[PDB]
């Protein structure tokens, strides 16, 4: 069992330190290779330039063609497939426009129906998609 | 109309047994729901903890019947927990109450600190261990209420426990086994021994004994 002496503190804490790495969450947060491989670079939102639009096929049970947009991040030049959130919102987005992109909400997991997309477009040309969808804004170019 | 089959039910039918506590002193089996219905009256409040459905796999196919976990409780008194399977739901519920009154147990109410007034909490931290579910009941000071999951919260409102701490272990998501575990703990209140009950007991007669002359006539 567990060592239960009174002069055994360094063994207990060294054992704890070595066994904290096998926790994948603590290793992901503290070893920090997922922090460098993150396209956002530990950022809540990123800003890119639209490169093309791709219709990606969904999972096998739910058949749909989700209209993702391939953008190039201004920061480090990584290619991002970001899902345009709502229906009819693919119409507003246009090639070579400055775009603000956020994740879906599983902290780095392809959420649900779409393999390879864990990002969603929030803003285009410094106006939101929610304003354009609800008839609140006029899009500049 | 209430019809007696036990001799205990015959004694309860007349005014020979004053309260429910002559049964519990002697651990006599309460085999009729309507004994419990007689002694407590309308004080027994209850709400169904869950109706979980199990589809019975049969020779013809799959046809479902429903299992009712109901919790009946006399406040600052007694609790019972009933589990009943039936074709309907309301039939399963009524079977669950009539089965839960058979499972009425008295819980012990004690004190945390100094002993002033009516008892309020579990007298000593007990445990209920049912099918990988482990419910610990810890005494608590006045007015803190019961800190627990909703279903043991229900059973501890019904127990008359005003305030206690609760710890759970295992798969809690099985509601029925969780409720059976905490029910086992509040039964283990009298299954536990305290230094208060260290005096040598004096043995009274079992209700069958001094009242057998009336059972000769029946």
């Amino acid at each position: 069992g567990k060592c239960r002496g009174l002069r055994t503190a360094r063994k207990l804490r060294s054992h704890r330190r070595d066994q904290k790495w096998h926790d994948k969450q603590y290793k992901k947060a503290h070893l920090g290779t997922a922090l460098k491989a993150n396209p956002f670079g530990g950022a809540s939102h990123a800003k890119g330039i639209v490169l093309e639009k791709v219709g990606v096929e969904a999972k096998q049970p739910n058949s749909a063609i989700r209209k993702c947009v391939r953008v190039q991040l201004i920061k480090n030049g990584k290619k991002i497939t970001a899902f345009v959130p709502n229906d009819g919102c693919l119409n507003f987005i246009e090639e070579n426009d400055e775009v603000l992109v956020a994740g879906f909400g599983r902290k780095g997991h392809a959420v649900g129906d779409i393999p390879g997309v864990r990002f969603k477009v929030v803003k285009v040309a410094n106006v939101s998609l929610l304003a354009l969808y609800k008839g609140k804004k006029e899009r500049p170019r | 109309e209430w019809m007696p089959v036990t001799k205990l039910g015959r004694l309860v039918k007349d005014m020979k047994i004053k309260s429910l506590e002559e049964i519990y002193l002697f651990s006599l089996p309460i085999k009729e729901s309507e004994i419990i219905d007689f002694f407590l009256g309308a004080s027994l409040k209850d709400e169904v903890l869950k109706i979980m459905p199990v589809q019975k796999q049969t020779r013809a196919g799959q046809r479902t019947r429903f299992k009712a976990f109901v919790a009946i409780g006399d406040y600052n008194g007694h609790v019972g927990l009933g589990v009943k399977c039936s074709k309907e739901v309301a039939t399963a519920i009524r079977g669950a109450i009539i089965l839960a009154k058979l499972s009425i147990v008295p819980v012990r109410r004690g004190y945390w600190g100094n002993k002033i007034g009516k008892p309020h909490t579990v007298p000593c931290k007990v445990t209920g261990r049912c099918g990988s579910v482990l419910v610990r009941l810890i005494p608590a000071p006045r007015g803190t209420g019961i800190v627990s999951a909703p279903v043991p919260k229900k059973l501890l409102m019904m127990a008359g426990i005003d305030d206690c701490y609760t710890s759970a272990r295992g798969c809690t998501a099985t509601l029925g086994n969780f409720a059976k575990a905490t029910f086992d703990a509040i039964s283990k209140t009298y299954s536990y021994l305290t230094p208060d009950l260290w005096k040598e007991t004096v043995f009274t007669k079992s209700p069958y004994q001094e009242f057998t002359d009336h059972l000769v006539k029946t």
Partner: protein, 180 residues
């Protein structure tokens, strides 16, 4: 550096369980019974009572002969009595644990002006408090969360400048009387 104070306290706690019918029922019943604007007034009163009870409970773990046990015990008793909740016969530290939420909402200026009947209805009472027509002693109070003391309860008036008070009739009356 600046000559400023950044001491600020959140005076309410959001409940952990967001949608349960029991909590929503008790909160809405209490709101309707003493006429509050939203749930945050209930949550504020709940948090104040929780702090008082937790202080009392953290006092009870000390010895009976502990000096600060006695000192802040007497202080807590005196404050809870002068605010108008406890009574002089109930000066014991364990009786604060026998307090509930509405015992703190009965001392609001809204409920006090309703119970003393100087206004008509409890929503009318809240309106009359915020509409600047009701004063305490000599100071005009326009805030319905004003927790009225026991000794200051016995004199609440109509704020003499008000039309319900001494005089100076309002805008609507002076417009109506200058019609013809």
């Amino acid at each position: 550096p600046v000559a400023r104070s950044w001491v600020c306290r959140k005076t309410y706690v959001t409940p952990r369980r967001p949608f349960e019918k029991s909590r929503l029922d008790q909160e809405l019943k209490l709101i309707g019974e003493y006429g509050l604007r939203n749930k945050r007034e209930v949550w504020r009163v709940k948090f104040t009572l929780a702090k008082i009870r937790k202080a009392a409970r953290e006092l009870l773990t000390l010895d009976e002969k502990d000096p600060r046990r006695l000192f802040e015990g007497n202080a807590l008793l005196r404050r809870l009595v002068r605010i108008g909740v406890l009574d002089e016969g109930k000066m014991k530290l364990d009786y604060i644990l026998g307090l509930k939420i509405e015992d703190f909402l009965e001392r609001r200026l809204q409920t006090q002006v309703f119970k003393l009947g100087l206004a008509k209805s409890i929503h009318h009472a809240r309106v009359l408090i915020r509409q600047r027509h009701i004063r305490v002693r000599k100071q005009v109070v326009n805030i319905p969360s004003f927790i009225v003391r026991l000794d200051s309860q016995k004199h609440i008036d109509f704020s003499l400048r008000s039309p319900y008070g001494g005089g100076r009739p309002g805008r609507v009356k002076r417009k109506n009387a200058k019609k013809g």
